[PDB]
Amino acid sequence: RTTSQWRELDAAHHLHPFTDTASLNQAGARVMTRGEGVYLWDSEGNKIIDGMAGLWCVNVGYGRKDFAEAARRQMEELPFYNTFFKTTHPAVVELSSLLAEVTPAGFDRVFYTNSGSESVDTMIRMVRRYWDVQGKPEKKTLIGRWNGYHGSTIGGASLGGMKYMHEQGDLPIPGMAHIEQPWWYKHGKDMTPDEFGVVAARWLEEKILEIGADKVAAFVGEPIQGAGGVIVPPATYWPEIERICRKYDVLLVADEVICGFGRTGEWFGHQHFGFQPDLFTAAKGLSSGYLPIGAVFVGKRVAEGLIAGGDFNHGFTYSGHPVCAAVAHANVAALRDEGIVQRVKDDIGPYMQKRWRETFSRFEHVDDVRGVGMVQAFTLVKNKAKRELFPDFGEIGTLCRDIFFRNNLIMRACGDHIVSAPPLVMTRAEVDEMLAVAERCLEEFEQTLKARGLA
Amino acid sequence: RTTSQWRELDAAHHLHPFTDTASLNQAGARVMTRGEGVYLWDSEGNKIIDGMAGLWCVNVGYGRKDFAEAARRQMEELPFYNTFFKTTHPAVVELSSLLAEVTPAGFDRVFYTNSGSESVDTMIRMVRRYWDVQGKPEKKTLIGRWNGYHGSTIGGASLGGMKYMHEQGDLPIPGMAHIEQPWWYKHGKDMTPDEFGVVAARWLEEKILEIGADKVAAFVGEPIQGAGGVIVPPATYWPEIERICRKYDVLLVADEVICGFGRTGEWFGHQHFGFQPDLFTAAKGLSSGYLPIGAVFVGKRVAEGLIAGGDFNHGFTYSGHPVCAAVAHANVAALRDEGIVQRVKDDIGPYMQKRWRETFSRFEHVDDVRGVGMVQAFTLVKNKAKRELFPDFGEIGTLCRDIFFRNNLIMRACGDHIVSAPPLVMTRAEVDEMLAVAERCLEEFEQTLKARGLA
Numbered sequence: 001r002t003t004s005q006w007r008e009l010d011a012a013h014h015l016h017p018f019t020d021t022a023s024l025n026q027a028g029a030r031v032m033t034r035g036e037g038v039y040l041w042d043s044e045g046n047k048i049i050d051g052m053a054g055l056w057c058v059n060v061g062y063g064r065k066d067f068a069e070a071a072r073r074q075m076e077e078l079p080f081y082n083t084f085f086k087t088t089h090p091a092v093v094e095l096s097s098l099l100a101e102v103t104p105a106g107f108d109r110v111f112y113t114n115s116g117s118e119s120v121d122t123m124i125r126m127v128r129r130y131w132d133v134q135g136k137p138e139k140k141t142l143i144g145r146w147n148g149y150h151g152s153t154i155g156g157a158s159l160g161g162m163k164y165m166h167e168q169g170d171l172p173i174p175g176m177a178h179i180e181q182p183w184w185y186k187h188g189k190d191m192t193p194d195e196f197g198v199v200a201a202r203w204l205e206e207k208i209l210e211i212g213a214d215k216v217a218a219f220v221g222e223p224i225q226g227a228g229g230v231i232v233p234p235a236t237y238w239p240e241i242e243r244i245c246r247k248y249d250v251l252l253v254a255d256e257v258i259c260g261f262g263r264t265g266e267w268f269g270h271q272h273f274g275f276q277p278d279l280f281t282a283a284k285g286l287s288s289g290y291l292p293i294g295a296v297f298v299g300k301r302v303a304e305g306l307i308a309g310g311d312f313n314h315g316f317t318y319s320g321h322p323v324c325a326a327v328a329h330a331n332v333a334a335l336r337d338e339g340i341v342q343r344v345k346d347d348i349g350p351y352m353q354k355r356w357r358e359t360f361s362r363f364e365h366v367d368d369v370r371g372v373g374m375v376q377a378f379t380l381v382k383n384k385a386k387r388e389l390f391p392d393f394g395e396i397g398t399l400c401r402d403i404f405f406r407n408n409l410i411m412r413a414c415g416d417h418i419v420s421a422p423p424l425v426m427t428r429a430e431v432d433e434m435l436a437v438a439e440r441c442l443e444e445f446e447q448t449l450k451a452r453g454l455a
Numbered sequence: 456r457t458t459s460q461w462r463e464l465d466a467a468h469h470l471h472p473f474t475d476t477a478s479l480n481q482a483g484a485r486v487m488t489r490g491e492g493v494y495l496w497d498s499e500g501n502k503i504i505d506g507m508a509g510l511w512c513v514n515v516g517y518g519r520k521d522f523a524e525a526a527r528r529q530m531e532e533l534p535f536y537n538t539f540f541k542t543t544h545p546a547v548v549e550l551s552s553l554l555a556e557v558t559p560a561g562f563d564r565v566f567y568t569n570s571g572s573e574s575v576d577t578m579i580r581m582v583r584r585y586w587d588v589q590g591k592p593e594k595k596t597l598i599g600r601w602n603g604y605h606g607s608t609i610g611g612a613s614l615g616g617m618k619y620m621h622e623q624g625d626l627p628i629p630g631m632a633h634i635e636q637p638w639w640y641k642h643g644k645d646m647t648p649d650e651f652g653v654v655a656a657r658w659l660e661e662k663i664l665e666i667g668a669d670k671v672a673a674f675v676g677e678p679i680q681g682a683g684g685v686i687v688p689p690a691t692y693w694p695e696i697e698r699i700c701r702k703y704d705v706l707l708v709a710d711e712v713i714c715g716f717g718r719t720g721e722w723f724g725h726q727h728f729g730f731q732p733d734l735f736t737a738a739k740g741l742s743s744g745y746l747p748i749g750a751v752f753v754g755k756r757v758a759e760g761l762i763a764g765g766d767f768n769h770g771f772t773y774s775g776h777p778v779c780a781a782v783a784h785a786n787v788a789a790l791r792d793e794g795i796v797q798r799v800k801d802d803i804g805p806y807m808q809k810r811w812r813e814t815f816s817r818f819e820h821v822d823d824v825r826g827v828g829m830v831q832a833f834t835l836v837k838n839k840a841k842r843e844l845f846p847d848f849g850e851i852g853t854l855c856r857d858i859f860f861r862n863n864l865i866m867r868a869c870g871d872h873i874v875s876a877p878p879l880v881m882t883r884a885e886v887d888e889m890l891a892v893a894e895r896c897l898e899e900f901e902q903t904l905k906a907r908g909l910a
């Protein structure tokens with residue numbers, strides 16, 4: 001099939017996630033055909049640096065023939081059996097055992113899903129069920145954040161803080177609340193980041209006291225806000241959030257769907273920020289996106305509460321899917337046994353973070369250069385000295401993203417935030433190759449800015 | 456690993472869907488290891504007739520080496536790329552094109568998910584977005600049915616009518632309503648099924664007038680209620696439901712997650728019952744459960760409304776997953792090209808339905824023997840002449856299910872309904888083998904009933 005033919009069929013038959021379908025069907029979809037390591041090829045033969053690892057998820061990179069063999073072997077033996085009929089199967093038991101080896105102490109039990117969105121919905125029902133079992137049926141509100149992202153289920157979209165999502169489906173659903181995000185560049189006023197971290201965390205205490213602690217089930221947050229634009233909270237933030245949750249007997253939930261499976265150099269983002277959640281949600285890196293699988297990692301407190309409650313009337317046909325479980329097992333064993341996570345912490349993470357800051361700090365219209373391990377970002381700004389953002393936040397980001405894409409580099413615009421999360425296996429040479437393209441793209445971005453009198 | 460070892464690890468580490476974890480961890484999980492055609496083997500070497508095709512989904516049966524090859528080939532070439540970044544990939548374009556060939560007229564466009572539950576959430580947001588685009592932001596309530604099942608997302612569980620699910624998570628969410636199910640055995644009084652069908656459909660008109668048509672977005676139903684116990688509505692029901700929806704400007708949605716991909720002998724259950732939905736939800740048979748994938752099939756009217764609305768701020772990381780798409784393609788091509796769906800309509804379906812009625816009609820405590828194509832059921836009853844059900848509806852079904860399972864036959868109890876949905880490829884010999892075991896099991900069931908003084 002030609003590029004033209006694939007585009008014709010895509011436009012005629014396919015509705016995409018988070019897309020202006022009318023626009024895409026006219027402009028034509030870019031057809032990605034092949035992946036190897038950190039690179040993609042499109043139908044026009046372009047070699048592309050995937051600085052987003054598929055969608056924050058292809059943590060071991062493309063081309064794992066060993067994962068394809070594990071999928072083939074399991075699909076030939078038992079492609080599917082359900083976990084509903086007082087039944088199990090070896091692939092799901094083996095994965096559950098391996099996950100207990102790599103997760104923090106106290107995380108013995110896992111509930112399986114297909115997606116991060118299903119994991120968040122599962123976590124919401126688990127949190128509410130937990131408090132019902134404790135004899136507190138009033139304790140049902142989950143608190144999230146504006147510009148937080150917790151997936152695209154009605155439940156996940158509700159707990160997320162994307163107004164563009166809320167306005168499609170009449171969200172949020174009841175028993176959801178939101179506090180402002182710990183975005184120092186915009187909300188920091190004359191505070192230091194560390195001062196601001198305590199203030200941004202105390203917005204949770206304010207919201208708890210407004211609602212009433214007796215009605216608040218949980219606080220949920222991404223250790224680093226992903227889709228919101230790699231919002232890295234100050235070092236003082238998570239310890240204050242945790243103090244507040246424990247003071248008011250509110251459960252603390254990490255959304256690890258991006259930060260999980262080595263993205264920060266720790267196995268999990270909550271380990272990097274030094275907080276101890278009761279539950280955490282996972283997908284993406286769990287299987288390096290090779291097959292759909294998500295999980296809720298359930299701490300001892302909530303697991304004992306759920307087990308005390310008899311039936312949990314929840315789950316998905318494909319929960320624990322043997323083939324997805326077999327591939328996730330291969331993926332997690334690789335992340336440990338090949339030293340991929342340890343390499344992010346001790347080697348490629350510090351290299352990426354140093355080189356990221358070296359590359360982007362000098363630009364007139366770049367600020368808040370940031371990152372941890374193998375997640376990094378910056379913001380395109382009208383004026384650094386004034387911390388002044390561009391109007392129509394997102395228009396300038398789209399301009400920059402389109403320049404990257406034209407130059408066969410994938411980095412994502414989140415409003416006017418530019419973000420990167422490449423495969424964890426990226427080499428030092430590949431980091432420098434990626435930053436060389438990004439640097440030339442920013443030089444062109446700045447030229448165009450001044451040319452249009454936008455600078 | 457031994458049976459004992461698998462059970463120890465499962466109990467220590469795995470939380471199952473729709474399970475009493477405390478009970479399962481004591482009793483021990485049955486470990487399914489291998490599948491071939493209509494049979495499973497457990498860790499103790501028992502050969503099992505899978506009369507439920509995994510979970511209503513393994514439509515082409517176990518052992519498709521060609522599906523494992525398609526998965527391996529795609530996973531080696533491009534295991535994952537996202538459909539979010541104005542991007543596509545061959546596997547998703549090819550599947551989208553093939554689906555348009557096999558789906559009813561007007562269904563050109565498909566939105567992908569991982570699960571039936573995600574497909575239902577997608578459909579809810581699509582229906583609400585549609586009415587917003589039409590300038591009717593009041594038009595947001597979806598009506599389902601008591602004992603309807605639409606998955607295990609917060610959205611799907613809300614639209615579903617399982618009270619045991621509603622009581623876990625504070626459901627239903629707003630803009631959800633429910634009417635009684637068209638269950639003639641319980642609600643039929645001295646009406647004929649056809650008389651009852653019109654009355655049960657008019658419950659929808661009554662509910663619409665109670666709420667106000669201006670507030671009602673859609674009516675959603677499974678053509679045949681699956682998890683509710685294969686509730687087969689009268690022939691008069693769906694045409695009346697459709698008349699009522701069109702009269703009041705309400706969208707009509709088929710949940711095809713079980714009935715889809717040949718289960719009734721039609722490609723889709725709505726075709727068998729003769730109604731024209733605006734959207735339908737799918738999973739299970741879409742890939743014969745070989746990998747997780749679901750879809751919303753969007754009719755011309757709702758697709759034009761969504762496309763008119765610019766951005767649809769919805770979707771999942773693994774929407775359109777290349778490897779799942781490659782396997783679904785192989786599955787759908789097999790269902791068509793190997794004549795599997797046609798064979799249900801013209802050959803094995805009528806054989807199953809005749810043999811099912813021949814086998815179960817004679818039993819003193821069996822009634823409402825029913826089915827079409829390769830979905831069939833009956834109800835365990837205290838007294839046929841009185842249409843008297845057993846008290847604690849579900850206790851007697853569990854007794855019967857446990858006898859089946861002990862005799863290496865998988866049939867599911869839905870309350871006191873016994874249901875079957877085996878692989879569509881089941882032979883006449885395999886139908887007779889399955890019914891011979893079920894028959895001997897019902898003889899034992901009746902003995903035990905009387906022994907316990909429950910009869």
Ligand SMILES: Cc1ncc(COP(=O)(O)O)c(/C=C/C(=O)C(=O)O)c1O
Nearest residue numbers: 115116117150151226255257283771772
């Ligand atoms: C923190 C967090 N929590 C949950 C989800 C939902 O997982 P999926 O339902 O498997 O998509 C995501 C995913 C975000 C994107 O889809 C994206 O990358 O734009 C996430 O980052």
Ligand SMILES: Cc1ncc(COP(=O)(O)O)c(/C=C/C(=O)C(=O)O)c1O
Nearest residue numbers: 316317570571572605606681710712738
């Ligand atoms: C009509 C209908 N609509 C939606 C779903 C949800 O799909 P998944 O999210 O893929 O589980 C189901 C599934 C039912 C079962 O899980 C079961 O068979 O017990 C369904 O039958």
Ligand code: NA
Nearest residue numbers: 035036037039
């Ligand atoms: Na290569």
Ligand code: NA
Nearest residue numbers: 103104105271
């Ligand atoms: Na630890």
Ligand code: NA
Nearest residue numbers: 104105106276
């Ligand atoms: Na710990």
Ligand code: NA
Nearest residue numbers: 170171595629
């Ligand atoms: Na509303």
Ligand code: NA
Nearest residue numbers: 188189190191
């Ligand atoms: Na400041």
Ligand code: NA
Nearest residue numbers: 018149227539
């Ligand atoms: Na997103």
Ligand code: NA
Nearest residue numbers: 266271272273
């Ligand atoms: Na640390």
Ligand code: NA
Nearest residue numbers: 266271272273
């Ligand atoms: Na650290």
Ligand code: NA
Nearest residue numbers: 338339340425
């Ligand atoms: Na390696």
Ligand code: NA
Nearest residue numbers: 342345346347
């Ligand atoms: Na170290």
Ligand code: NA
Nearest residue numbers: 355358359435
């Ligand atoms: Na540089």
Ligand code: NA
Nearest residue numbers: 390391392393
């Ligand atoms: Na603005």
Ligand code: NA
Nearest residue numbers: 458459483499
């Ligand atoms: Na045994």
Ligand code: NA
Nearest residue numbers: 528531532533
């Ligand atoms: Na290859």
